[PDB]
Symmetry: C2
Subunit: 54 residues, 2 copies
Protein backbone atom coordinates (compact mmCIF):
# COMPACT_ATOMS: atom_id res chain seq x y z
CA UNK A 1 0.00 0.00 0.00
CA UNK A 2 1.21 3.48 -0.89
CA UNK A 3 0.11 6.51 1.12
CA UNK A 4 -0.12 8.52 -2.10
CA UNK A 5 -3.54 6.96 -2.68
CA UNK A 6 -4.77 8.23 0.66
CA UNK A 7 -2.85 11.49 0.42
CA UNK A 8 -4.59 12.45 -2.81
CA UNK A 9 -7.76 11.94 -0.81
CA UNK A 10 -6.40 14.40 1.79
CA UNK A 11 -6.43 16.98 -1.00
CA UNK A 12 -10.09 16.25 -1.76
CA UNK A 13 -11.14 16.16 1.91
CA UNK A 14 -9.62 19.59 2.54
CA UNK A 15 -11.64 21.07 -0.32
CA UNK A 16 -14.72 19.10 0.72
CA UNK A 17 -15.15 20.76 4.13
CA UNK A 18 -13.03 23.76 3.20
CA UNK A 19 -10.63 22.99 6.02
CA UNK A 20 -7.26 21.45 6.85
CA UNK A 21 -6.96 17.64 6.86
CA UNK A 22 -4.02 15.41 7.84
CA UNK A 23 -3.63 11.64 7.72
CA UNK A 24 -0.97 10.07 9.92
CA UNK A 25 0.55 7.02 8.23
CA UNK A 26 2.13 5.17 11.15
CA UNK A 27 2.44 1.41 10.53
CA UNK A 28 -1.27 1.37 9.56
CA UNK A 29 -1.85 2.51 13.16
CA UNK A 30 -2.64 6.12 12.43
CA UNK A 31 -5.52 8.57 12.29
CA UNK A 32 -7.21 11.12 10.04
CA UNK A 33 -7.62 14.49 11.71
CA UNK A 34 -10.17 16.84 10.22
CA UNK A 35 -9.56 20.31 11.60
CA UNK A 36 -12.35 22.81 12.19
CA UNK A 37 -12.35 26.50 13.00
CA UNK A 38 -15.98 26.65 14.10
CA UNK A 39 -18.42 24.37 15.89
CA UNK A 40 -20.51 24.71 12.74
CA UNK A 41 -17.88 22.96 10.63
CA UNK A 42 -17.56 20.44 13.44
CA UNK A 43 -21.26 19.53 13.28
CA UNK A 44 -21.04 19.34 9.49
CA UNK A 45 -17.87 17.20 9.44
CA UNK A 46 -19.39 14.73 11.89
CA UNK A 47 -22.42 14.65 9.61
CA UNK A 48 -20.32 13.40 6.69
CA UNK A 49 -18.62 10.86 8.97
CA UNK A 50 -22.11 9.65 9.84
CA UNK A 51 -23.24 9.74 6.20
CA UNK A 52 -26.87 10.25 7.15
CA UNK A 53 -27.67 11.04 3.53
CA UNK A 54 -27.60 7.30 2.94
Amino acid sequence: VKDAVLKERESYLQNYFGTTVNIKRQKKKGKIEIEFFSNEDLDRILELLSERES
Copy 2:
Protein backbone atom coordinates in the same frame (compact mmCIF):
# COMPACT_ATOMS: atom_id res chain seq x y z
CA VAL B 1 -22.46 25.49 22.24
CA LYS B 2 -21.88 22.45 24.43
CA ASP B 3 -19.39 19.76 23.44
CA ALA B 4 -21.78 17.10 24.75
CA VAL B 5 -23.67 17.36 21.46
CA LEU B 6 -20.54 16.55 19.50
CA LYS B 7 -19.26 14.09 22.07
CA GLU B 8 -22.37 11.93 21.78
CA ARG B 9 -21.50 11.87 18.09
CA GLU B 10 -18.01 10.61 19.02
CA SER B 11 -19.77 7.58 20.50
CA TYR B 12 -21.64 6.96 17.24
CA LEU B 13 -18.58 7.55 15.04
CA GLN B 14 -16.55 4.98 16.98
CA ASN B 15 -19.23 2.35 16.43
CA TYR B 16 -19.68 3.45 12.81
CA PHE B 17 -16.16 2.56 11.65
CA GLY B 18 -15.54 0.24 14.58
CA THR B 19 -12.57 2.32 15.66
CA THR B 20 -11.41 4.98 18.12
CA VAL B 21 -12.51 8.59 17.54
CA ASN B 22 -11.56 11.77 19.41
CA ILE B 23 -12.72 15.36 18.96
CA LYS B 24 -10.52 18.12 20.31
CA ARG B 25 -12.62 21.03 21.59
CA GLN B 26 -10.11 23.88 21.64
CA LYS B 27 -11.77 27.32 21.28
CA LYS B 28 -13.61 25.98 18.20
CA LYS B 29 -10.13 25.57 16.73
CA GLY B 30 -9.87 21.82 17.05
CA LYS B 31 -9.98 18.64 15.01
CA ILE B 32 -11.68 15.25 14.79
CA GLU B 33 -9.22 12.39 14.62
CA ILE B 34 -10.52 9.09 13.30
CA GLU B 35 -8.02 6.39 14.17
CA PHE B 36 -7.42 3.35 12.00
CA PHE B 37 -5.53 0.12 12.55
CA SER B 38 -5.42 -0.89 8.90
CA ASN B 39 -5.11 0.87 5.54
CA GLU B 40 -8.43 -0.80 4.76
CA ASP B 41 -10.23 1.15 7.49
CA LEU B 42 -8.35 4.21 6.27
CA ASP B 43 -9.74 3.88 2.73
CA ARG B 44 -13.21 3.26 4.16
CA ILE B 45 -13.09 6.21 6.60
CA LEU B 46 -12.01 8.57 3.83
CA GLU B 47 -14.90 7.19 1.80
CA LEU B 48 -17.42 8.34 4.42
CA LEU B 49 -15.68 11.73 4.64
CA SER B 50 -16.16 11.96 0.88
CA GLU B 51 -19.76 10.71 1.09
CA ARG B 52 -19.66 9.34 -2.44
CA GLU B 53 -22.93 7.54 -1.79
CA SER B 54 -24.62 10.88 -2.37
